[PDB]
Symmetry: D2
Subunit: 448 residues, 4 copies
C-alpha cells in the first residue's frame, strides 16, 4: 500500500546503479567471511560468489535488466542473484543489515573516486609547476585591490595557485584515511551477532582499519561532509584562479588568451575570446558549496542511529565527484594551452610601481623609514611638475631632498632588479621561484 | 587537457528537455511579432509556426530524437525545424539572442510550476484546517523545550502549522508576480534592435508586464533565488511538522500513528512503525536549502551582464520544483490518513500542568500576580510533601496557604475548563479555534488564484 | 545554575537595544490590563510614570545594569519594581517572556526596516539622477567580460537601479507580515485573562493581530524573510561593486572613486583602492552567513518555544546595521565617482559594430544567416588589408554584397548603434528616459 | 574619507584581541630587522622596550583606546612613538599590513586551537569515563526514533565520544597547516630586505615558513578549514543534544539534567527544561553561518590582497568563543545528568527479542530465511494467544520448529541480548571495554599535541 508518490522520494534507481560494483564486492567479501563462520559451506560460497560475478559483468557490459519492484541496488541485485543462483542467496543476508551496506558501498565508491580526483588534482598542480619553471623570465604587475602594486614574476603567480592547490591535496588525502575505515560488520546498529571476522572483511576490501562503534558507523556521515568541505575549498581556489584568468583574458588587460578549445567566440568578432571554461569552473564553486550546505543541514539535529534522512548523501557525493573530475581536467587544459603575451605584461609595468623601491634605497643606505618614505614623496612630487617618468629625474634632484641619494639610484629604476630584491624564502626573486619549483616537485613525490 | 569535457559542464540535454514546450512557445510568440515587423512574410510565418507545432507534438508524444551534436534545447530545436522547414528557419533567430531565450524559457516554466505547487500547498492547509474542525474536542499537552506546558487543543496545534503554511502561500504569490514579467525582447544585452512589439509578445505568452531594463533582465536571476528562498522556508516549516509528528508517533509518546502507506516496519516487530514519509520530507529541507545557497553563491560577485555561470540555475530550479511537489502531496497524505490516540493525548495531561491555572484562580479573586504565583507554589510543594497530586489537595489544605481558596477552586482542575480560558484572539479556546478556522477558509479562498 | 551556561543565554550586551520597544510594549499591556480589571486606574498611572522614567534612563545611558540581569525583560522589570515596588508585579499577569521576545524584535524591526527603506530609496534615487545627467555617455557592453556592443552609461546604472528597486518591493512585503502583533499569545496558548488585543494592536500601531498563539510564539519567518531579502540585496550590491572595481582599474580606466571612499599612498598617487566597493562586496557573504545560520536554527525544531530561537536577535541586529551602513556608503560612492567620458569613448571600437552591419543588411530584406555571413567577409577582408571595418571602401563592401549602399557609413556611428534599441527597455535615448520615469513613479507610489 | 565607510572596517573592539599577538609579531620582526642591518643593537633593544611596555598596557588594562585610531597595527604603531620617539617608525621597513594581519591571526588561532583542543578532550574523556562506569545499564537502541533493539547505554555514549574523536583528529590536521609563518612575505612579492624568515619562525614558535608570498597573503584556508571543523563538530553536538533532549522528556523519562544546566518553574518543580542542550544545538547554525559567510567572501576573489579578506577576524573570533563555551557546557551536562537505570529497563520489551530468537535458530543450523519465518510464527502465535514472545512454552515453540530446545529460554534475557554482539565494535560488555581502552589511548596520542 506504500504511497506511489512516497516512493518518489526514496527511489533513486538511476542514482543507485553506480553503486552496483561496490555492492557486489561487499556481498562477496561478506559471503567469504560468512563461510568462515559456518553459516555457509564451501560449496554454497562458490555458488554465491559465481552468481555475484555474473551480475558484475551484467553491469559492466550494461546488460543488467532493471525491474519495477527494484527500490535500491541492494534489492535490484539480491533479486538478480536469486534469479541466477536461487533461494540459496537468502543466506548472504544472515547477520547483515541494509544500514551496513549503504555506508559500506559509499565509503568504497568514495575511496576509488578520490583516487581519480587526486590524480587529476596532482596533474593539475604539476602543469602549473612546469609552466612556471618555463616562463621564469616573464614579469607582470602584482595586483592588490585590483590595482598595479609592484613588479612581480609571472611564474611566482602561477605558483601561488599551485601551492594553494597542493594544500587541497594534503586535505584530500587526509579525508581518505578516514574514508578507508571499513564499516561493514556494524549490523543494523548494534554490531554483528554472528561473531564474524571483521578483520577478514577489512583486508578483503583493502580497507585501512576497522570501525570502532557500531551505533556510530551506522549514523555518521562525517565522511561525506569532510569530503564536501575539501571539495568546496578546492573550488574556492579554482574560482579565484578563474577570476584572474578571466580578468587577464580581457582586452583591457590583454595579458593572455585562452585556447579556442576552452573558450567561445563569433565570426563577426574574431578578436574576442570568451572564457567559457573559466566561468563554468567558477560557477561550479556554488554548485559544490551547495551540496555541502545541504548535507550539513540534513545531519543537524538528527536523533541517534539510522534515519531515512541519511539517504540524501548519495546524490550529493556523485554530483561533486563528477563535477570535480571535469572541473579539474579542464583546469589543466586551460592552463596548458592558454598563450600569454610577454609584451603586454611588461608594457603594463609602469615606473610608478618603482617608487617603493626608491625608499628601500635610502634605508639600505641607513636612512630611517619615515625619512626614506617622505623622501620618495618629494621625489614623485617634483616628478609630476616636470611631467616626466620618475626614472628620468636628476641625480641632483635626488640629493636635493636627501643627501644619501647617490649614483646607485639608477638601478632602482629596473624591473628585474626590482623583482630580484625578494630573494628571501617565498619572494618573487628567480632564486626563490626555483626553490618553490623544487619544493613542489618534491611534494609531488611523497604523495606517490 | 579536456576540450570535449569542457563541453560536459555547459551541457545538459537530459535537463534542457524540460524546456521543449516553453521554448517552442516563445519561438511562436516571437515569430508572430517578427512577421508584424516585416522580417517574415505572412507565408514564411505560417511555415515556421507549422514547423514549431510539429516539434511541439514530437516532444509531446515522446517521439522526439536528439543527436550527439545537440548542445541545448535551442540548438536541438532549431536543428529539427531547419530539418522540417529548411533554410527558412533562420529568419527566426533574427534579432533575438540566447540570453533572451534563457530567462524567457525559465520564467515560463516556473509560472506553470508555481501554479502547481500553489495548488498542492492549498491542499495541505485545507487538509489541516479541515481536520482541525473535525477534531476540535481533542485535547493534549502543549510543549516547550519538549516539556509538557499546559492543556492546548489538538486543533490549535494543527492550525498553528496551517497558519505558518498560509504565509508560505502568500510569499509564493508574490514571487510569482515578479516572475510574471516578460524578459523576451532584451536581445543579448541592449534590447531588440528591430523595434519588435514587446507588448504583442507580452500578450502571446500572457505575462503581466514587460522587462524594464535589458541589461538587468538578461543578467538577473532574482526570480530563481527568490523562489528558492520561499521554497526553503516552506521546507523549514514542514521540517518542524515532520519533527512534531515523528516524536508524537513514537511509542514513548503514543499520540498518533501513521498509515501503512506512509511508513514502514519490520516483520518480527509488527508494533514498530517507522515514519519514513516524515523523515524524507524533513530531510528535503536540506536538499532545497542547498540549492538556495548554491545559486546565491553563483551570483555573488558576478560582473554585469550575461556570464556562463548563470547556466547553473536550471538544475537548481527543477530539483526544488519536483521536490516541493512530491513533498507537499506526501505531506497532505500523511495528515489526511494518520490515526489519533484521543486516549493517550488526554492521558498525557497532568494536574501539575494546572498549577498556573491555580495561581490565576487567585488573580481573578483580586490577588496580586506575584502573590498568586507563590500561593500556587506552596500548594504544589505541600501536595508534593503529602505525596499527592495538587488536584487532590483539601480545600482546607488550600485555605491554609490562603483563605481566598474557595470551594469553587475545583473548576480549576478540569482540562476542558483550562483551555477554555484562552478565548482571546488566537487562543486555544473552542471559540478562538473556530474563528481561526473561519479566517483560514477566507484566506484559502483569498489566496486561491 | 551554571556560570558558563549563562554565557550563552545572558547577553545584556546585545539585548540592551530592545529596551525602548520593551518599554513601549509593557506600557501598552499595562493599559490593557487596567481595562481588564487586573490593574486599577491609580495603579496604571503609577506604572506608566515609572515605565516612562525607565525610558529616559536608557536614552540618556544612565541606566545601571545589575549583575543578575539576564534579558532586557529582567533588567527593566527589576528597575520598575525598585522604582514603584509591588505594583509593578501585577504588570506580568497573564504574560510570558515568550510573547515579549517576538513583540520586541518585531517592533524593533518595524522601525529598522523603515530606516533601511529610506536609505535604499536614496541610493536608487541617486542612481537614477546620474543616469539622467550622464544620459549621453556611452561605453562598451560586456558579456563574459568581453566587449559585446555599445550601450548608454545610463542603461548600465539603470540596470542596477531597476534591480535595487525589486528589493524595495520585497522589503515592503516583508514589512507587512512583520506588522502583525504577537502580543497576547501567552506562553503558547494565548492570553488567559481575555486581554483586549485590539486595543493592544492599536496602542502599538500594528496593522493587525496574530491568528494562532502557538504559531505566533514559535515562528521566525519574519526573521528569515528579512534575511533572504537583505542577502539578495547585498548580492545586487555585490554585482554592482564588482562592475565598479573592474571599471576603476587603470586597465579599464572607465572611472575612479572620490578620495572619501578609497585609500592610497603618496608613492603611487595614480593608484586608488576602492575599499568602499570591496567592503560592500564582502558584506554579501557576511549577511548570507546570517541567513544560513537562522535557517539551520529552525530546521527540525519541535513546536512552540525553544531556547534555540534566541539566536535571531544578534542576526537581525547585524544585518540591520550592515545594510544601514552599506546602503549609505554605496549612495556616496555613486554620487561622487568621477567618470572619464573620453576613456569610455575610446573603449568603443569598430569590431563592435560588425553586428550593426549585418543588421543593416537585414533591413534591406536580406535574410539572417546571409547577412551574418556577409558581415563575416566584411570583417575578414578588412582584416587581411590591415584596416578597421569602418575604413574599408564602399566598392570593397559591394564586392561582398551589392546591397551595401552608401548609408552603410551611418552604421559606423556609435550613437546610431545605441539608438537602434528603441524597443521597450532597450538602450536608446528614449528608452532610458522612459525607464527613469517608471522608477521615479515606483518610488512615488511606495511612499506610504 | 567618509566616516560612514569607517564603520565597515574600523572596529578596535574586535581588533584588540590581536593586541598581544601583534606585539610579539613585532618583537620578532625587530630582532630580525637588526640582523638585517637596518636597526643597530642600540635601536633594537630600545624598540623592544616599547613593545614589552605596550603588551603590558592592555595586559593589565591601561592602554588608551585611541578615538582616532582603528586597527591595532596603528594603535600600537602610535603608542610606541608615544614611548620610543620617532625611532618606532623604523620598525616597519620592508614589512606590510598584509603580513601582520595574517601573522597576527594564525598566532591567535594557534593559541586558540590549543585551548579548544583541551575542552574537547575533556568532553571525550568525560563520555568515555561515564560509559566505562555504567557498562551494565541497558536500554533501547533507536532507529527512526522507534525501538529497534536492546543496546548498552555505554555503547551509546561511546558512539558520541568516538565521532568527537574524529573532530579532535581533524582539528589536529588544521592546527598543523596553520603552524606555518606567513611573516616575511611582504605586501605581495615577499620581503625585499632579505630578512631571515627562519629567525622569525624560531622566534614566533611556528613550525614552517610560507612557500609563496602571494599565496600567504591572499589565502584564508586556515580560516575556512578551522570553520569547517568547528561546524562538523557542532553537528555532532547538536545530534547529541537532540538525543539527550528527547531522552530527558517525561514520555521517555530515561534521564534528567542537573539543576545547574537546566531551567524550571516554582509551579512545575518536575518539568525540567534543557536550556543547556538547546543552546548547544542552536550554535550549530551560528557556527555554520560563519563558515558559510567566509566561504562566500573568498569565492571568486581576484588574486592577492583585497579588503574583502577583512571579515575573517569576526568569524574566527566568534566560532572560537562559541566552541569554548559550548564544549564546556557539554562536559558539564553529561557528567552531571542523572540516569534512570529503571526507566531504561522497563523500556526493554519482549517483542524486541524476536530477532534474537530467529538468530537462535540460525546458529542451531536453520538458514536465515526460515529462522525469520519461524520467528514470525512465534510472534503470530503469541498474538492470538494473548501473551508475549517469552511466555510461549517449549511445546509452543516446538510446534513451530523442532530445533527449539530448552536453551531457547536464554534468548529472553536482555543482557544475553546485547552479549551476542562481540564482534569488533559491537555492544557486548567486552567489546565496550575494548572501545573504552582504544579511546583512552587515542586520547593520549591527542593529548601530545
Amino acid at each position: 500500500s506504500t504511497d506511489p508518490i512516497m516512493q518518489m522520494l526514496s527511489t533513486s534507481m538511476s542514482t543507485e546503479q553506480r553503486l552496483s560494483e561496490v555492492d557486489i564486492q561487499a556481498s562477496i567479501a561478506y559471503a567469504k567471511a560468512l563461510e568462515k563462520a559456518g553459516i555457509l559451506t564451501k560449496t554454497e560460497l562458490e555458488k554465491i560468489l559465481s552468481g555475484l560475478e555474473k551480475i558484475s559483468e551484467e553491469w559492466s557490459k550494461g546488460v543488467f535488466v532493471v525491474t519495477q519492484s527494484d527500490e535500491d541496488i541492494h534489492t535490484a541485485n539480491e533479486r538478480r542473484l536469486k534469479e541466477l543462483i536461487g533461494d540459496i542467496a537468502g543466506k548472504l543476508n544472515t547477520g547483515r543489515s541494509r544500514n551496513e551496506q549503504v555506508v559500506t558501498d559509499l565509503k568504497l565508491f568514495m575511496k576509488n573516486s578520490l583516487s581519480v580526483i587526486s590524480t587529476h588534482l596532482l596533474q593539475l598542480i604539476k602543469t602549473l609547476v612546469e609552466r612556471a619553471a618555463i616562463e621564469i623570465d616573464v614579469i607582470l604587475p602584482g595586483y592588490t585591490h585590483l590595482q598595479k602594486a609592484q613588479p612581480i614574476r609571472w611564474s611566482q603567480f602561477l605558483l601561488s595557485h599551485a601551492v594553494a592547490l597542493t594544500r587541497d591535496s594534503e586535505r584530500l588525502g587526509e579525508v581518505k584515511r578516514r574514508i578507508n575505515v571499513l564499516p561493514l560488520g556494524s549490523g543494523a546498529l548494534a554490531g554483528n551477532p554472528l561473531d564474524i571476522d571483521r578483520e577478514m572483511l577489512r583486508s578483503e576490501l583493502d580497507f585501512a582499519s576497522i570501525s570502532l562503534n557500531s551505533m556510530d558507523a551506522i549514523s555518521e556521515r562525517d565522511f561525506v561532509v569532510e569530503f564536501l568541505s575539501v571539495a568546496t575549498l578546492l573550488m574556492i581556489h579554482l574560482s579565484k584562479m578563474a577570476e584572474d584568468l578571466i580578468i587577464y583574458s580581457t582586452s583591457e588587460f590583454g595579458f593572455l588568451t585562452l585556447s579556442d578549445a576552452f573558450s567561445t567566440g563569433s565570426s563577426l568578432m574574431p578578436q574576442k575570446k570568451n572564457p567559457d571554461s573559466l566561468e563554468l569552473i567558477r560557477s561550479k564553486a556554488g554548485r559544490v558549496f551547495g551540496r555541502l550546505a545541504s548535507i550539513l543541514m540534513v545531519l543537524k539535529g538528527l536523533p541517534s542511529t539510522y534515519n531515512k534522512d541519511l539517504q540524501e548523501d548519495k546524490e550529493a557525493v556523485f554530483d561533486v565527484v563528477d563535477t570535480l573530475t571535469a572541473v579539474l581536467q579542464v583546469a589543466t587544459g586551460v592552463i596548458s594551452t592558454l598563450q600569454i603575451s610577454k609584451e603586454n605584461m611588461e608594457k603594463a609595468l609602469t615606473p610608478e610601481m618603482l617608487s617603493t623601491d626608491l625608499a628601500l634605497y635610502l634605508v639600505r643606505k641607513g636612512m630611517p623609514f619615515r625619512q626614506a618614505h617622505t623622501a620618495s614623496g618629494k621625489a614623485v612630487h617634483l616628478a609630476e611638475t616636470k611631467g616626466i617618468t620618475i626614472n628620468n629625474l636628476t641625480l641632483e634632484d635626488l640629493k636635493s631632498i636627501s643627501p644619501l641619494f647617490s649614483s646607485d639610484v639608477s638601478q632602482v629604476f629596473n624591473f628585474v632588479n626590482s623583482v630580484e630584491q625578494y630573494t628571501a624564502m617565498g619572494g618573487t626573486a628567480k632564486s626563490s621561484v626555483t626553490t618553490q619549483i623544487e619544493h613542489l616537485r618534491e611534494l609531488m613525490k611523497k604523495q606517490k
